């Protein structure tokens, strides 16, 4: 098994911590959802190749521009997250997160991930966003942003229901293995 490193980046409201927790336990916690994620090394076999995939969160580092980049050395794949219930989190992808990741992780594949996809058809979410003249992010808006920023690909998931979570980390492993 070869060792690879994954780092997830995105705004504070993007759901990155929850995504790492649900993947690492293969379960949305039934009793207590942790506030923070330390690290984890997942054993993943993708397309016949065994990898030890180290997982890291940047939650808590969003306001600290000299501490945050210490998370990036030797990263092999980036998950760049936004929440589908927050068009504001998608707006910050090309102007802030993308230039930073391209600077500190040159040539590292980026997978743009739309989190909380279960909220796209949630009535409370649609009512709340309508007050700010907004609506949940459409799949084509996510794909277009991923295309514009030079992402390796675009994927969606729901940490709440686990749908799409395994597929995101298996694809991240395949991207990390590419030359």
């Amino acid at each position: 098994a070869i060792r690879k490193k994954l780092v997830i980046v995105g705004d504070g409201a993007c759901g990155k911590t929850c995504l790492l927790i649900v993947f690492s336990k293969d379960q949305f916690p039934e009793v207590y959802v942790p506030t923070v994620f330390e690290n984890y090394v997942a054993d993943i076999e993708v397309d016949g190749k065994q990898v030890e995939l180290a997982l890291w969160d940047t939650a808590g580092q969003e306001d600290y521009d000299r501490l945050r980049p210490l998370s990036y050395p030797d990263t092999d794949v980036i998950l760049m997250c936004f929440s589908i219930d927050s068009p504001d989190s998608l707006e910050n992808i090309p102007e802030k997160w993308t230039p930073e990741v391209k600077h500190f992780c040159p040539n590292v594949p980026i997978i743009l991930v739309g989190n909380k996809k279960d909220l796209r058809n949630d009535e409370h979410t649609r009512r709340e966003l309508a007050k700010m003249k907004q609506e949940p992010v459409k799949p084509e808006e996510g794909r277009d942003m991923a295309n514009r920023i030079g992402a390796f690909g675009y994927m969606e998931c729901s940490a709440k229901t686990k749908d799409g979570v395994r597929e995101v980390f298996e694809m991240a492993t395949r991207a990390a293995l590419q030359a």
Partner: protein, 245 residues
């Protein structure tokens, strides 16, 4: 970690750690507050354990088995004794607050109602000045430590054998040298997230809400000071590269 504390924090939450007959005596809001305080203490116990792996397993093992050039072990593990002293002392205070709160006849049933004052004390005065000085130094030496490790692992056979030997056990899976360094750098930025969530469930006693609000502000002041005090050191960087920053 020692077995007594590992067992006390083995459960995924405070609600699963205490006896169910004790849990049922509390309101939902108290259970929510206690679950987050339990996560702050549990993650602090694990952070002190990361520092013990760095000092005892790695640093001391390299001094006792290998023939590294002087200053190499300090370069790999900058400030580790100072970091261990800071966090072992803080963990001791958190565990003593829990122990005093235990019901007589129990080693697991407790409620911590006054965490705010302990956090204000940790994040103010000389202990905050020592945390700021130590993390500004450690985080500025983080890149240099990772590069020194990579160079030694690629070029020194006895160093490679030592690392592969002590990191082979499954309990070290998440704790290689580079992983320990980043776990330590990331610890300080977990505190605001945990404190804000404890504060969300601490409105019942106004003095507690005010104390956690003060502690959250002190923690963010410490983080801002550390972040402004960092500049990565680089082996071989010339003075001209530094003064042209």
């Amino acid at each position: 970690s020692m077995e007594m504390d590992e067992k006390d924090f083995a459960a995924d939450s405070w609600s699963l750690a205490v006896d169910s007959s004790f849990l049922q005596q509390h309101k939902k809001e108290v259970m929510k507050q206690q679950d987050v305080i339990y996560e702050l203490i549990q993650t602090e116990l694990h952070h002190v354990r990361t520092l013990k792996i760095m000092t005892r397993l790695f640093r001391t093992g390299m001094l006792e088995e290998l023939h590294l050039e002087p200053g190499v072990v300090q370069g790999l593990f900058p400030c580790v004794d100072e970091l261990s002293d800071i966090h072992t002392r803080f963990l001791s205070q958190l565990l003593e607050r829990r122990r005093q709160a235990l019901c007589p006849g129990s080693t697991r049933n407790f409620v911590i109602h006054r965490l705010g004052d302990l956090l204000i004390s940790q994040f103010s005065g000389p202990s905050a000045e020592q945390m700021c000085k130590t993390y500004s130094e450690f985080c500025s030496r983080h890149s240099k430590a990772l590069k020194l490790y990579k160079e030694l692992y690629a070029r020194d056979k006895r160093f490679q054998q030592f690392i592969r030997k002590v990191t082979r056990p499954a309990v070290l899976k998440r704790h290689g040298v580079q992983e320990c360094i980043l776990l330590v750098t990331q610890r300080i930025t977990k505190y605001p997230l945990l404190i804000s969530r404890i504060l969300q469930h601490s409105h019942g006693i106004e003095e507690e809400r005010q104390d956690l609000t003060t502690a959250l502000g002190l923690v963010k002041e410490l983080l801002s000071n550390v972040d402004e005090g960092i500049y990565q050191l680089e082996k071989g960087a010339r003075l001209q590269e530094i003064y042209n920053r």
